[PDB]
């Protein structure tokens, strides 16, 4: 043979390195390994999207849990915060719920107040003062 591959072992090893910790022949035999390793890689790429979703769901669950301890539902809370112009993201809100509970409680209270104000507004179709924690800071 003119030129045949001297370096093939190394190629084999490249894939088997990523397959070391699989069960059974998937970690020993290159043919089986390759399919598995590729699949794993694919999963990893896909999983990035999944991870983000999962985290946000977890945060929502946590915030919901926290909110129920103060007699409020998640959606009400979030909406009232949005109305207030307090734009804390849900990671941060979850952190607050866990690590800084008095602040969380305060936030909940604020939300409740906002809700109440909204309700009040709904009764009297128009006027007068709009309420104290309502209103919006106008940027120009």
């Amino acid at each position: 043979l003119r030129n045949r591959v001297t370096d093939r072992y190394f190629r084999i090893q490249e894939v088997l390195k990523h397959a070391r910790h699989f069960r059974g022949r998937k970690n020993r035999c290159y043919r089986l390994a390759v399919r598995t390793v590729i699949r794993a890689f694919v999963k990893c790429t896909k999983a990035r999207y999944l991870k983000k979703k999962n985290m946000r769901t977890l945060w929502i669950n946590r915030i919901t849990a926290a909110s129920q301890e103060h007699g409020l539902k998640y959606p009400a809370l979030i909406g009232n915060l949005v109305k207030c112009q307090v734009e804390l993201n849900r990671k941060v809100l979850a952190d607050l719920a866990i690590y800084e509970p008095k602040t969380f409680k305060s936030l909940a209270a604020l939300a409740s107040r906002r809700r109440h104000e909204g309700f009040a507004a709904a009764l009297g179709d128009g006027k007068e003062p709009e309420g104290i924690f309502s209103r919006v800071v106008q940027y120009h």
Binding site: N61, R62, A65, I98
Partner: protein, 59 residues
């Protein structure tokens, strides 16, 4: 908080026992709450891997 670490951790976790009286209530309206409690979804610490579920007594 103050607290040493392990005890703080214990405080954070620890399975609480809850009570529910039936009497005229709908099952499943009980179970919703009970299930939630079991899961530990009522805690802002919740995760499926952590094992944060509480005890539910129903009478």
């Amino acid at each position: 908080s103050s607290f040493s670490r392990a005890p703080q951790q214990w405080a954070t976790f620890a399975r609480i026992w809850y009570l529910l009286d039936g009497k005229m209530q709908p099952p499943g309206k009980l179970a919703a709450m009970a299930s939630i409690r079991l899961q530990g979804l009522h805690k802002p610490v919740y995760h499926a891997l952590s094992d944060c579920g509480d005890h539910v007594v129903i009478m």
